[PDB]
Amino acid sequence: GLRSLTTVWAEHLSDEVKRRFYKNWYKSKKKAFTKYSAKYAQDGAGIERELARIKKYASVVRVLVHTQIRKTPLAQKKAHLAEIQLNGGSISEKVDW
Amino acid sequence: SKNSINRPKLTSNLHHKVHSLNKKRAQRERAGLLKPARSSVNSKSGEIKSVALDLYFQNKKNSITTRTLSKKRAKKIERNLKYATQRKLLVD
Amino acid sequence: AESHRLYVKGKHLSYQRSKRVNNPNVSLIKIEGVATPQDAQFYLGKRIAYVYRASKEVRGSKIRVMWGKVTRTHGNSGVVRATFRNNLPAKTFGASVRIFLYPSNI
Amino acid sequence: AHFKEYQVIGRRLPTESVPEPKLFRMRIFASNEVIAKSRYWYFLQKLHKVKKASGEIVSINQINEAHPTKVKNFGVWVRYDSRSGTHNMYKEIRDVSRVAAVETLYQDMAARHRARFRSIHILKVAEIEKTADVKRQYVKQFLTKDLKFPLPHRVQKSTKTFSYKRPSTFY
Amino acid sequence: ASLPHPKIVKKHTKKFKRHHSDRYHRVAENWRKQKGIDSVVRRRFRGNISQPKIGYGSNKKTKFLSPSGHKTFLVANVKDLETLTMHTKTYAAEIAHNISAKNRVVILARAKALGIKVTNPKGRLAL
Amino acid sequence: VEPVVVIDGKGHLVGRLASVVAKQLLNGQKIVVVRAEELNISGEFFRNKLKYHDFLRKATAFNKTRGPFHFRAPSRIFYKALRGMVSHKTARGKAALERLKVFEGIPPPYDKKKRVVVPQALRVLRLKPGRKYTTLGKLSTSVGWKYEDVVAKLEAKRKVSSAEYYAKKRAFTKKVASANATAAESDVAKQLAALGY
Amino acid sequence: MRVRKRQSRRTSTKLKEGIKKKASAHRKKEKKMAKKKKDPGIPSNFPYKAKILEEIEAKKMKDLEEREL
RNA sequence: UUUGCUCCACACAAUAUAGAUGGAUACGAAUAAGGCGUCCUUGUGGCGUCGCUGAACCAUAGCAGGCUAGCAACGGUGCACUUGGCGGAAAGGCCUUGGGUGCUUGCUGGCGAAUUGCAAUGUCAUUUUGCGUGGGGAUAAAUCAUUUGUAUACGACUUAGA
RNA sequence: GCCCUGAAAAUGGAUGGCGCUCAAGCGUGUUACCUAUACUCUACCGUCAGGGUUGAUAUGAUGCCCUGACGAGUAGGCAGGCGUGGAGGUCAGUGACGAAGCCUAGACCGUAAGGUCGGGUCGAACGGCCUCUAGUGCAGAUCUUGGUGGUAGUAGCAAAUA
RNA sequence: AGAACUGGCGAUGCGGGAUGAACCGAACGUAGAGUUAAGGUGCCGGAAUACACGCUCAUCAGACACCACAAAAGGUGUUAG
RNA sequence: GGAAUACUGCCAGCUGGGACUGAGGACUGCGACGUAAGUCAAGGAUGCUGGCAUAAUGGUUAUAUGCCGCCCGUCUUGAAA
RNA sequence: GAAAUUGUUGAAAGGGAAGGGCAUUUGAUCAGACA
């Protein structure tokens, strides 16, 4: 079957997603992606490596989006994260987009 | 198994069990809970085993209390030992 | 050298058995490279060791050995019947045994 | 088993009213002497009312092929009793010896007409002296001039469970 | 040392437990012949417990010898012990369970003097 | 004789290969079967599809989640054929089955390992010519297995890589053959010839 | 498609022993009912027909030559 | 957290065998056909040769493999480095650059071996955890309780709170 | 002769299963091989039978020695034994330096009934042998009396307004 | 269905027929060794994926008893007469 | 015309390998080889050697594995339920 | 001061029984003997 090969995240993630990664956000130090933002500091060599790996090997590319739930009237502050598949264009075009 | 036919399951469990079993056994042996070797000076092979006598001599040499010496039996052992010492006294 | 072997590798196959009755006192050993009962006549009388390890360091060693001998052939495919002083445990069905070259007729 | 051909010679027990009775001979194919001699007695029962207890066996002698290394076309004549009556048959057997031809025919009767050795009656076996006198195409197909045939798709018997080459069905 | 004997072979080393002595506490382990007409034990089916029969009788040359090679004799006093003075290689005196400690030391003294083997010399002795 | 025997599944008969492998496992030997999708069965395709559907009828009526489980992949069809040849409900049978690994295609690390064949289960040497036969990958695809195209794609890739490997190895054995033939007439070569070498 | 049920080939003990009873009954009834050749056969594809024919026709003299003195 | 945790260099306790003891030694396809070598006009080509099993091939000599002296080649091979490339099916492997230090049984020498007493697997892997041995790197969460009602019999679910 | 059709429903399943197709199917031939409490040989037990034995510087003559054959078993028959309460005799038997009893993966004898010993506990009586006697041996009787479980922290403690 | 006899079971284990009152084998003390019976030798399962001669392809083969039934026939299946 | 070989059978022909057993306990027997004393494989095992000298063998015991394994009793012997 | 039954401790086993037979592994435990 299909297999998740790798996952590359944005440099800056909002609080709304970071809340999704905690059960106890208020107690936390909110350390969610602190060792991962540094992968963008070193000219993005690791980020570029995994994106080239997706280009080389992936036959399905899915993007990860999330809702700006603060814009809704909802009381929930923990945003909703999902995988949305990208259709159209070649694999390299999907990754570049 | 039927979901993971390519993993050993019984064999992995048996390896894990033999490892944990003799790790526990070695833990017991290092704490000395096992009885010593037959040739050891601390062994009692060929000699009578008595909880009461062992506790009496452990209290005289001076804990475990599931093995307990009653004051009744302690007095009986003291009396028997007085008899035995008198016997050795008539011997020497 | 890198090979120090003076024994022929074997496998513990099963006890002597019927369809519904086994007999632990006799054990069936498959010798490597022996494919006919007339080839197996060479190994009759040879000593078999089941060498297995343990955890107690008993008598200066942590490796234990069961001793036995090849008694006769079995079938037509080169299986031999072997008997040990203590019969091999049934957990060893599929375990490697060692058939030494002694006593010799060569 | 593996057959032998016997002659079995017998006669009725002599009497005051008859010294030296007639001697009767049959050529019999059997595995050994005992089966052949019983075979003789069964046939002699059927042919005419001679009881085994009333007669004797004057001789029994194995018959060998005169030329047991010359391939002959054999014409074998058979009656039998399988499975729902009685029949005549005539089988060509290209073969070397009469006993091998007879054993081949017994195997053929067991294979096709499902008949046991006790159900088969060998009536006459004859070396066809002339190849023009052969009547069955399955034997007449090996008599042709300059005969050659391959043995396509050779299967190699392997003494090893595993092989490290895909096997070949060559020559 | 003992009077010479062959190997002491026991034709059935395991005790003959009673049939369902394991299933029920009320059924003791003392052997009992199963008297039921349909007892698979009595009919001697495959895979059931073995029953006593005379085929298991021990060798007559060895039937009452302990592993040391002596027939055990129960002694209660010095007088009983001395009946084994001329039979020291064929009998070993066992001291009865109820002999007191002082009488036991008297028995051991006499036994060592006569060379009679005593089976349980360790006994009630807590010197 | 090997520590692990990697059997190429292609061209083999399911029952005969299963019996061979089962007796190997029960004897203490570790067996890996690769390319389970090119494995063969005797009889026309429709006949074996019908036999599989006959198997596929069986299910616990009151709760189908506990009935027979009809595993569709050719590795699992072979495994089912093999598990019936072992007393798998015992500890010995379970232990022997765990000396077996069966795969579709040839995944790593066995793609770099020697593959063997079992001649007494090879369809070529066993099944009489002209008799119909069934390739297990077709049967599995027909009755549900949904990764035939994937395995075909990866097998084509593996064959490309292995062809490159074999070209290199054949070049090197050409060089070595030239070298051994250039030394094929020396004194030591003739001495080895006297000893059958 | 939808393959139907296949009858079991696993015979029962009851059926099998019933067949034995039926077969014995059939043997006995056949004996009871039974209590209430046109071929010498020299085959027409045997090659030596004429030779053996002539030989046995020569042997028809003995059945009438000798019997009377 | 008497610095808990992790990753690097040694010394041993505990070691572990569903069963190590020279090497799992890699085309694909066909089987009424193919493998290999060579040539050209590069083909469903020509020529030669091979199978008929792996009974093969590679390794393989040394105190379980010691200590030394040379000859001949500049080969093979081990180890720790390092160069570049390839491998995503479960890649965790394969190939390659360079130096460094060993070994070399390709060849010839010198010394040792004993007494394990006529055999007893006679132990020669790593398998890891760890009391410790001295250098690095790292500085969170989860649950209960409170709360929510998109959930709920109770658990569970979904929220919020420095 | 083999093959096909030669009807038969109803949970999902059966040449015992896998599976097998120049069979692992069908008929037959040849061998090799596997295996019962059977057969052969030996040892041990018991029974039965046939011989021998007063010989004493040796014991027990229902004892001993030699030899052979046998060994299923309900009702039932015969025989030999094991165990328990009380009685006569005896061991000038055991016992506060611990009787009896009870507990005990500690030991030994017996084919077995059972018997013996070690340790713990106990605290005042009890055994061996020859006999005598009987309210003499339990797994059951929807057995009797007593005690105790699972069920189970379960059903339930919700009528009569609070 | 009746008669007459003889065997089997009752009271009886053991090997085999996957399984088992009625089948095949089998003189029941405790063992050891050998050899076997009936049945078997692909794997489950001890034992030849033995040798050999043929036949058979079944879109639910057969492995099975048979002077047993459905069974008398039907077939541009194949083989020998 | 001369053999040879196969097949079958015989030898009180020779010679290997493997396994199980070692009962009995002065002598007496029948034998054999011997020139004889004697010796012997002839009315049942002895010789030489090593290791350990104790939990090593062994037992008890908890288990694990292989194969076996109605659940007892009563009454029904017939599904023998 | 038994057993049923129960608590704690120590050991061990457990993938829709438990128990029992033969054999042996492993762990725990344990008796005996001096040319």
UniProtKB/Swiss-Prot annotation, chain A:
Free-text disruption phenotype from the record: A mutant confers resistance to trichodermin, a trichotecene toxin produced by plant-pathogenic fungi.
Cellular location(s): Cytoplasm
Membrane-spanning ranges: none
Phosphothreonine: modified positions: 6
Chain positions found as Phosphoserine: 59
Site of covalent link Glycyl lysine isopeptide (Lys-Gly) (interchain with G-Cter in ubiquitin): 39
Subunit comment: Component of the large ribosomal subunit (LSU). Mature yeast ribosomes consist of a small (40S) and a large (60S) subunit. The 40S small subunit contains 1 molecule of ribosomal RNA (18S rRNA) and 33 different proteins (encoded by 57 genes). The large 60S subunit contains 3 rRNA molecules (25S, 5.8S and 5S rRNA) and 46 different proteins (encoded by 81 genes). uL3 forms together with ES39L one of the contact sites for the signal recognition particle that targets ribosomes to the endoplasmic reticulum membrane.
Miscellaneous information on this protein: Present with 450 molecules/cell in log phase SD medium.
Function: Component of the ribosome, a large ribonucleoprotein complex responsible for the synthesis of proteins in the cell. The small ribosomal subunit (SSU) binds messenger RNAs (mRNAs) and translates the encoded message by selecting cognate aminoacyl-transfer RNA (tRNA) molecules. The large subunit (LSU) contains the ribosomal catalytic site termed the peptidyl transferase center (PTC), which catalyzes the formation of peptide bonds, thereby polymerizing the amino acids delivered by tRNAs into a polypeptide chain.
Protein name: Large ribosomal subunit protein uL3
From Swiss-Prot, chain D:
Designated gene of the protein: RPL20A
Modified residues (Phosphoserine): 31
Domain of life: Eukaryota
GO-annotated biological processes: cytoplasmic translation
Covalent link location (Glycyl lysine isopeptide (Lys-Gly) (interchain with G-Cter in ubiquitin)): 124, 130, 148
GO cellular component, one term: cytosol
UniProt entry tagged with the keyword Transferase: no
HAMAP family found in the cross-reference section: Ribosomal_eL20
Role noted for this protein: Component of the ribosome, a large ribonucleoprotein complex responsible for the synthesis of proteins in the cell. The small ribosomal subunit (SSU) binds messenger RNAs (mRNAs) and translates the encoded message by selecting cognate aminoacyl-transfer RNA (tRNA) molecules. The large subunit (LSU) contains the ribosomal catalytic site termed the peptidyl transferase center (PTC), which catalyzes the formation of peptide bonds, thereby polymerizing the amino acids delivered by tRNAs into a polypeptide chain.
Annotated protein name in UniProt: Large ribosomal subunit protein eL20A
Family the entry assigns: Belongs to the eukaryotic ribosomal protein eL20 family.
GO molecular function: structural constituent of ribosome
InterPro entries per record: Ribosomal_eL20 (IPR028877), Ribosomal_eL20_dom (IPR023573), Ribosomal_eL20_eukaryotes (IPR021138)
Subcellular location, record wording: Cytoplasm
Entry keyword Acetylation: no
Other remarks in the entry: Present with 54300 molecules/cell in log phase SD medium.
Keywords, comma-separated and alphabetical: Cytoplasm, Isopeptide bond, Phosphoprotein, Ribonucleoprotein, Ribosomal protein, Ubl conjugation
UniProtKB/Swiss-Prot annotation, chain E:
Single GO MF descriptor: structural constituent of ribosome
Subcellular location: Cytoplasm
Record's keyword terms, sorted: Cytoplasm, Phosphoprotein, Ribonucleoprotein, Ribosomal protein
Keyword Cell membrane: no
One GO BP annotation of this record: cytoplasmic translation
Entry-linked PROSITE patterns: RIBOSOMAL_L32E
Residue positions, PTM Phosphoserine: 39
One Pfam family this sequence matches: Ribosomal_L32e
Lipid metabolism among keywords: no
Primary location: cytoplasm
Gene Ontology cellular component terms for the protein in this record: cytoplasm; cytosol; cytosolic large ribosomal subunit
Database matches in InterPro entries: Ribosomal_eL32, Ribosomal_eL32_CS, Ribosomal_eL32_sf
SMART domains attached to this UniProt entry: Ribosomal_L32e
Function: Component of the ribosome, a large ribonucleoprotein complex responsible for the synthesis of proteins in the cell. The small ribosomal subunit (SSU) binds messenger RNAs (mRNAs) and translates the encoded message by selecting cognate aminoacyl-transfer RNA (tRNA) molecules. The large subunit (LSU) contains the ribosomal catalytic site termed the peptidyl transferase center (PTC), which catalyzes the formation of peptide bonds, thereby polymerizing the amino acids delivered by tRNAs into a polypeptide chain.
Family statement: Belongs to the eukaryotic ribosomal protein eL32 family.
Quaternary data: Component of the large ribosomal subunit (LSU). Mature yeast ribosomes consist of a small (40S) and a large (60S) subunit. The 40S small subunit contains 1 molecule of ribosomal RNA (18S rRNA) and 33 different proteins (encoded by 57 genes). The large 60S subunit contains 3 rRNA molecules (25S, 5.8S and 5S rRNA) and 46 different proteins (encoded by 81 genes).
Gene that encodes the chain: RPL32
From Swiss-Prot, chain F:
PTM annotation: N-terminally acetylated by acetyltransferase NatA.
Subcellular location: Cytoplasm
Gene3D superfamilies cross-referenced by the UniProt entry: 1.20.5.4280, Ribosomal protein L13
Subunit structure, interactors included: Component of the large ribosomal subunit (LSU). Mature yeast ribosomes consist of a small (40S) and a large (60S) subunit. The 40S small subunit contains 1 molecule of ribosomal RNA (18S rRNA) and 33 different proteins (encoded by 57 genes). The large 60S subunit contains 3 rRNA molecules (25S, 5.8S and 5S rRNA) and 46 different proteins (encoded by 81 genes).
Family that this chain belongs to: Belongs to the universal ribosomal protein uL13 family.
Additional information: Present with 43300 molecules/cell in log phase SD medium.
Name used for this protein in its record: Large ribosomal subunit protein uL13A
Keyword annotations of the record: Acetylation, Cytoplasm, Isopeptide bond, Ribonucleoprotein, Ribosomal protein, Ubl conjugation
Domain of life: Eukaryota
Main subcellular location of this protein, as a coarse class: cytoplasm
InterPro entries according to UniProt: Ribosomal_uL13 (IPR005822), Ribosomal_uL13_CS (IPR023563), Ribosomal_uL13_euk/arc (IPR005755), Ribosomal_uL13_sf (IPR036899)
One term under GO cellular component: cytosol
Gene: RPL16A
GO molecular function, one term: structural constituent of ribosome
UniProt crosslink position (Glycyl lysine isopeptide (Lys-Gly) (interchain with G-Cter in ubiquitin)): 175
Pfam families, alphabetized: Ribosomal_L13
The UniProt record lists the keyword Ubl conjugation: yes
A GO biological-process term: negative regulation of translation
